[PDB]
Amino acid sequence: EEIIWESLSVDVGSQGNPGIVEYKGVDTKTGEVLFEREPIPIGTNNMGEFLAIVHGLRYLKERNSRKPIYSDSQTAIKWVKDKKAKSTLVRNEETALIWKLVDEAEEWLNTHTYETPILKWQTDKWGEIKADYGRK
RNA sequence: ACAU
DNA sequence: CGATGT
Ligand SMILES: [Cl-]
Ligand SMILES: [Cl-]
Ligand SMILES: [Cl-]
Ligand SMILES: [Mg+2]
Ligand SMILES: [Mg+2]
Ligand SMILES: [Rb+]
Ligand SMILES: [Rb+]
Ligand SMILES: [Rb+]
Ligand SMILES: [Rb+]
Incomplete structure (x- = not known):
């Protein structure tokens, strides 16, 4: 219904799908870029979106952020x-x-706990997520 | 169909 | 127009 502004937004970007994949996380309120992954030569949109969420979980856990x-x-x-x-x-x-990064992200999920809510950004109501790459 |  | 996914 309403955007939770006190949040982290993540997104993948690519050159081709499959193709070169990267991702980043931003402060939803300010757009400040909090992390960016160096481009990976071949991956899919969905693998990158998955890695971005898991990196977000790790980033927030390390900083004791809920x-x-x-x-x-x-x-x-x-x-x-x-x-x-x-x-x-x-x-x-x-x-x-x-695939190494995906395997390692699954491994992290299987060995760590978190309470972080993972929420769907409602693009149809709110426009593009703030982490978007502006490429479409 | 929906989401990328 | 092509792709990745539930
Ligand atoms: Cl990663
Ligand atoms: Cl929440
Ligand atoms: Cl969902
Ligand atoms: Mg996305
Ligand atoms: Mg995007
Ligand atoms: Rb901690
Ligand atoms: Rb885009
Ligand atoms: Rb989108
Ligand atoms: Rb499809």
């Missing part, structure tokens, strides 16, 4: 809830890095 996380990705929200990224991307030498 803020929620907004994501626009129905898929990634579910994958984090399930602790399992059900990507179709081929596992081969070209995709080794993205």
Whole structure:
């Protein structure tokens, strides 16, 4: 209904899908960029959205912050809830890095706790999430 | 259909 | 127009 302004917003950006993937997290209220991942040569939109949420969880936990996380990705929200990224991307030498990061993010979820609410950013009502890359 |  | 996902 209403935006929770005291939150972290995350989003993926890419060049192609599959293609070069990056992600970032921003303060929803101010747009300040709080973290940005260096581009990964091949990944999917959904793998990047998943990594962005998990990085957000780790970032907030390290800082003892109870803020929620907004994501626009129905898929990634579910994958984090399930602790399992059900990507179709081929596992081969070209995709080794993205898959290593996804495997490591799942591993973190299976070995740590968090209370962070993971909320759907309601793009249809609110416009683009504040972490968006402005590329579409 | 919906979400990217 | 193409892709990734539930
Ligand atoms: Cl990562
Ligand atoms: Cl909340
Ligand atoms: Cl959702
Ligand atoms: Mg997104
Ligand atoms: Mg975006
Ligand atoms: Rb802590
Ligand atoms: Rb975009
Ligand atoms: Rb979107
Ligand atoms: Rb589809």
